[PDB]
UniProtKB/Swiss-Prot annotation, chain A:
Top-level taxonomy: Eukaryota, Metazoa, Chordata, Craniata, Vertebrata
Coiled-coil boundaries: none
Example GO BP: translation
Protein name in UniProt: Small ribosomal subunit protein uS12
Superkingdom, natural source: Eukaryota
Comp. bias regions, Basic residues: 1-19
NCBIfam families, alphabetized: PRK04211.1, uS12_E_A
Cross-link (Glycyl lysine isopeptide (Lys-Gly) (interchain with G-Cter in SUMO2)): K36
Described purpose of this protein according to its UniProt entry: Component of the ribosome, a large ribonucleoprotein complex responsible for the synthesis of proteins in the cell. The small ribosomal subunit (SSU) binds messenger RNAs (mRNAs) and translates the encoded message by selecting cognate aminoacyl-transfer RNA (tRNA) molecules. The large subunit (LSU) contains the ribosomal catalytic site termed the peptidyl transferase center (PTC), which catalyzes the formation of peptide bonds, thereby polymerizing the amino acids delivered by tRNAs into a polypeptide chain.
Post-translational modification: Hydroxylation at Pro-61 affects translation termination efficiency.
Subunit annotation: Component of the 40S small ribosomal subunit. Part of the small subunit (SSU) processome, composed of more than 70 proteins and the RNA chaperone small nucleolar RNA (snoRNA) U3.
UniProtKB/Swiss-Prot annotation, chain B:
Cited function: Component of the 40S subunit of the ribosome. Contributes to the assembly and function of 40S ribosomal subunits.
Subcellular localization(s) per the UniProt record: Cytoplasm; Nucleus
Portion of the full sequence shown: 78 to 133 of 133
Modified residues (N6-succinyllysine): K48
Subunit structure of this chain's protein: Component of the 40S subunit of the ribosome.
Organism for this UniProt entry: Oryctolagus cuniculus (Rabbit)
Name recorded for this polypeptide: Small ribosomal subunit protein eS30
Disulfide bonds: none
UniProtKB/Swiss-Prot annotation, chain D:
Function: Component of the small ribosomal subunit. The ribosome is a large ribonucleoprotein complex responsible for the synthesis of proteins in the cell. Part of the small subunit (SSU) processome, first precursor of the small eukaryotic ribosomal subunit. During the assembly of the SSU processome in the nucleolus, many ribosome biogenesis factors, an RNA chaperone and ribosomal proteins associate with the nascent pre-rRNA and work in concert to generate RNA folding, modifications, rearrangements and cleavage as well as targeted degradation of pre-ribosomal RNA by the RNA exosome.
GO cellular component: cytosolic ribosome; cytosolic small ribosomal subunit; nucleolus
Name of the gene: RPS9
Positions carrying Phosphoserine: S152, S162
Source organism of this protein record: Oryctolagus cuniculus (Rabbit)
The name this protein goes by in its record: Small ribosomal subunit protein uS4
InterPro entries, alphabetized: Ribosomal_uS4 (IPR022801), Ribosomal_uS4_CS (IPR018079), Ribosomal_uS4_euk/arc (IPR005710), Ribosomal_uS4_N (IPR001912), S4_RNA-bd (IPR002942), S4_RNA-bd_sf (IPR036986)
RNA sequence: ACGGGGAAUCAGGGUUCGAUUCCGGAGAGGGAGCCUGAGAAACGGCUACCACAUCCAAGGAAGGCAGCAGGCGCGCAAAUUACCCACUCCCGACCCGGGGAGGUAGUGACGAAAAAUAACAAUACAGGACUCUUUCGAGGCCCUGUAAUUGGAAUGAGUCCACUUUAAAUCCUUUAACGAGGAUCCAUUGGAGGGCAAGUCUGGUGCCAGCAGCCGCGGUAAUUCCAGCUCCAAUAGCGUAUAUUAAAGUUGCUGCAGUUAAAAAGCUCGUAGUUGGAUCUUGGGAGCGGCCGU
């Protein structure tokens, strides 16, 4: 505190109330700009219909194809690149199918060697991608 | 890019059948030898603190 | 073997009832049912086994003890006055009606169609 | 608007660092040396002291010979004397923190089968208590986490429906009537 | 953004949260007007207009679940069209009356508390405080063992007559007879380079498929992939994703920073705001405490 005075609570609080917006985490959680631009819109998960598949190339020194999925959601009608999490599980996903899509961890950020792909697939039409990969449930059709 | 060789290495691991198992002791029954083996079964020998699975 | 000491005895005269917290001791057997206990204050406090309403045997962790309760009334002329109608069907001389709430709460209210006295052209 | 409780708390601390070798060393010694069921059983033993500590740290820091200090400071010196750890005449509000983790299992019924010399080993202070073959004053106890006070230690004895107390022989001696008295008639 | 009582986290300060059972207010699709009554601007009253919508014999009627179930739509997201006047206490003329209020059972891994899946005796086989002998080996009061040894013992899963329990019972419980040697009464969920507890094991892949929060790993020796094994962590739980708190002394009141890492207005003037020099009753008078405290 640059000012310490005994009657300076209406400058300590008002200055803190101003400089807290320069905190990039605070301003993100308290504006109506970040909250709306989130493809999910303040959701932990979202169902979406697969309308094409994209073999996204790995970002830097690792040369590999990160076989991802273009997904349009139900609640928004906005489009999302969705990473198919476990090994070669794109052959459990077919075009015009409802997939449950989550974030990955870094909270609306591109994680690892997938450039600009912010989301992952969890389920494919009320059978989990784990049970499909582990071999515990059959494809629901 | 190439959505053709998807799950290429999954299929071509020769399916070695899972060797059958006597179930591990559960609850407290796990934690009896786990007391004995760590502390009091062995004598502190010469050298570094070795690993449990350290198969050198 | 039901060694009963009638503990915490108190006479209420504005309900005319002799009440007590019977501390029960009966170790080894199952729970003491309501078939035998009214016959003990027929041989302890020497009143009728007919006007007394004995209940509330509360087991502790082990099951070799309860702590009981009963209320002596003056007569069978007082056996259905300071006693609600739930406990009076529990010794034979009273029975509740059978007509369920999905009839009764509807039977009085199905009659709500046509006006006045003679509403009984709907339900019997 | 229902007459339901909803009043429930946790019993064990959520350990801040997950893979301290020191935690996997020190708090695994609290299994075989004292016979416990899993790591959750080890973790609540501190939390009971964490309850004791949190106020006891502050029940010294009150005003000198203040009746709010001298009652509540002595309200815990009516408490922590009674469980039977600190001395009868040499009780003291300052020695309350001078008190470690197993001081509970020095007094608590989870160990008390082994303590007096009425067990076989350390693990034997679970399996008899798992089958409620003991009591505390004509009152059977199946839960080994009973807080035995100073007073009722000699009253730690056996049930009457117990083949390892003052009772009747049980089921497999009656199921040996299929093997032993099945071949004998 | 219903507010508060509160909640989560918490050295100390703080920070987020409170639609949710208690209290106060507000609303009954949207507004608006009113009758009645002590008390509604009431919608389990009415009258309209605006939207929605079931009859119609096509003239004309009837309607409000943000009461309880149950649909439909919505979504990541949330149960059965169970069971009553018994606590309460209120209403009624009033001890006799009546109340999906209050209130009991289902679906319930939202969660929280307890809690099984071997503790004991001795043959397997190794140790050491120990006697002996250089090591040997025997000897063994005090235990540490655990290996596809023998086992005995039990309370409690599953299946259960009944009652204490109940506005009817069911469930622990109180408890009978019946019900455990891979005690099939069978534990999975994740990682196994580093952070970070735990394999430089073997095949297969060969910058492919993938793993990986971050750092990174794979270029035909992969401790990271895809698998087998053994191990490690937690354990009836655990992995994951999002908001949020601590860590964050990376919002700094306590407690940051501004020569060069981000940063001092180019520079003074200046009004509120903020902060503002020293200075105004001093010592002894009067008893005791074990010169001087009170």
């Amino acid at each position: 505190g640059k000012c310490r005075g005994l009657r300076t609570a209406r400058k300590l609080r008002s200055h803190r109330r101003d400089q807290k917006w320069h905190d990039k985490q605070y301003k993100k959680a308290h504006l109506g700009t970040a909250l709306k631009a989130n493809p999910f819109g303040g959701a932990s998960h979202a169902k979406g219909i697969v309308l094409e598949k994209v073999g996204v190339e790995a970002k830097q020194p690792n040369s590999a194809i990160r076989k991802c999925v273009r997904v349009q959601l139900i609640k928004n009608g906005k489009k999302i690149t969705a990473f198919v999490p476990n090994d070669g599980c794109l052959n459990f996903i077919e075009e015009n199918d409802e997939v449950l899509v989550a974030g990955f961890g870094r909270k609306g950020h591109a994680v690892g060697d997938i450039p600009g792909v912010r989301f992952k697939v969890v389920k494919v039409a009320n059978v989990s991608l784990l049970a499909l990969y582990k071999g515990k449930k059959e494809r629901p059709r | 890019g190439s959505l053709a060789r998807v799950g290429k290495v999954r299929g071509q691991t020769l399916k070695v059948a899972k060797q059958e198992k006597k179930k591990k002791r559960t609850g407290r029954a796990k934690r009896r030898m786990q007391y004995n083996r760590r502390f009091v079964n062995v004598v502190p020998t010469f050298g570094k603190k070795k690993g449990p699975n350290a198969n050198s | 073997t039901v060694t009963i000491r009638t503990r915490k005895f108190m006479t209420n005269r504005l309900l005319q009832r002799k009440q007590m917290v019977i501390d029960v001791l009966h170790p080894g057997k199952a729970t003491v049912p309501k078939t035998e206990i009214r016959e003990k204050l027929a041989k302890m406090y020497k009143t009728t086994p007919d006007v007394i309403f004995v209940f509330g045997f509360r087991t502790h962790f082990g099951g070799g003890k309860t702590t009981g309760f009963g209320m002596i009334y003056d007569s069978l002329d007082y056996a259905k006055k300071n006693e609600p109608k739930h406990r009076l069907a529990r010794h034979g001389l009273y029975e509740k009606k059978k007509t369920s709430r999905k009839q009764r709460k509807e039977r009085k209210n199905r009659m709500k169609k046509v006006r006045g006295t003679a509403k009984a052209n709907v339900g019997a | 608007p229902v007459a339901r409780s909803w009043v429930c708390r946790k019993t064990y601390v959520t350990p801040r660092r997950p893979f301290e070798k020191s935690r996997l060393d020190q708090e695994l010694k609290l299994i075989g040396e004292y016979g416990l069921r899993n790591k959750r059983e080890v973790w609540r033993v501190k939390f009971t002291l964490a309850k004791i500590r949190k106020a006891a740290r502050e029940l010294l820091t009150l005003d000198e010979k203040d009746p709010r200090r001298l009652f509540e400071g002595n309200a815990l010196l009516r408490r922590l004397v009674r469980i039977g750890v600190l001395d009868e005449g040499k009780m003291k509000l300052d020695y309350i923190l001078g008190l470690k983790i197993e001081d509970f299992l020095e007094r608590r019924l989870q160990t008390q089968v082994f303590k007096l010399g009425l067990a076989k080993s350390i693990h034997h202070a679970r399996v008899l208590i798992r089958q409620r073959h003991i009591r505390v004053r004509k009152q059977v106890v199946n839960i080994p986490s009973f807080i035995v006070r100073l007073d009722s230690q000699k009253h730690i004895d056996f049930s009457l429906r117990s083949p390892y107390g003052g009772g009747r022989p049980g089921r497999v001696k009656r199921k040996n009537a299929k093997k032993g008295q099945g071949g004998a008639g």
